[PDB]
């Protein structure tokens, strides 16, 4: 039974705060309507989101603790850090991040996404809204796999993530490959971190392939961002090239990040 094991609290965004009755562990209780589920998978027919969350169940990705099936919905019990703030609100309140802090955050996102790919999972909705900051541990967590897919090497022709983080080949041709599309969205994310908002709002900007910097950003960081946002997918860096880039060296540990920037 679901109502017996968890104390349900208020909305967080349909996601409710909750506590596991057993050990008072804070959880997030996420409800997904069957009628709205695009892709299904199996383990027992379940939403693909559950499939992907199980395949990645490492503190860099959110942990699915349990799930239930109801007549018209599935209920997902997800880990809830406390205290937490998502990266979107964090950037809104603090503005453009110092590069040392953006380096630590971006590095942790890179490790999390590498974890997803190694487990056969393509997230397809990397953005600041889908990243939680554990404010005490300085650890970041990738959330909301509701737009994801199994990782494959062939072309994708469907997409349901965030359009302003989607790559130009999707805008123009309705096709993309998983890894190079992910690298594009990471370029958008990195620009977002060091400039305080995403660079593109309109399709014409996305396919136009021009990056104007609205804040002081080091030449090394600008180079990495522009590389990630190469118009031609084959021109984009691999994850290894990103993490070997000069800008990415000497990252802070998560705990150092918390003590210098979050406490």
């Amino acid at each position: 039974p679901l109502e017996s094991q968890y104390q349900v609290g208020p909305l967080l965004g349909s996601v409710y705060s909750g506590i596991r009755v057993s050990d008072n562990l804070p959880v997030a209780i996420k409800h997904v309507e069957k009628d709205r589920i695009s892709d299904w998978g199996e383990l027992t027919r379940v939403p693909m989101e559950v499939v992907l969350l199980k395949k990645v169940s490492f503190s860099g990705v959110i942990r699915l603790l349990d799930w239930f099936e109801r007549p018209d919905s599935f209920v997902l019990i997800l880990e809830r850090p406390e205290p937490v703030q998502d990266l979107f609100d964090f950037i809104t309140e603090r503005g453009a991040l110092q590069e040392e802090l953006a380096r630590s955050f971006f590095w942790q996102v890179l490790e999390a996404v590498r974890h997803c790919h190694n487990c056969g999972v393509l997230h397809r909705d990397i953005k600041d809204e889908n990243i939680l900051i554990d404010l005490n541990r300085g650890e970041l967590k990738l959330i909301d796999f509701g737009s994801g897919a199994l990782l494959k090497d062939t072309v994708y022709t469907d997409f349901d993530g965030t359009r302003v983080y989607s790559p130009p080949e999707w805008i123009r041709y309705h096709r993309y490959h998983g890894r190079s599309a992910a690298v594009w969205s990471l370029g958008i994310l990195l620009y977002d971190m060091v400039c305080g908002d995403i660079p593109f709002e309109h399709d014409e900007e996305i396919i136009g392939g021009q990056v104007f910097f609205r804040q002081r950003v080091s030449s090394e960081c600008q180079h990495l961002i522009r590389w990630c946002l190469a118009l031609r997918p084959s021109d984009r860096p691999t994850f290894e090239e990103i993490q070997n880039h000069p800008w990415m060296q000497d990252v802070l540990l998560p705990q150092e990040t918390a003590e210098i920037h979050l406490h």
């Binding site: 809104t92 909705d125 953005k127 909301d144 993530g161 965030t162 305080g196 908002d197």
Partner: peptide, 8 residues
């Protein structure tokens, strides 16, 4: 300028 969330 208006920074905003973007639904998926």
């Amino acid at each position: 300028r208006k920074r905003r969330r973007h639904p998926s």
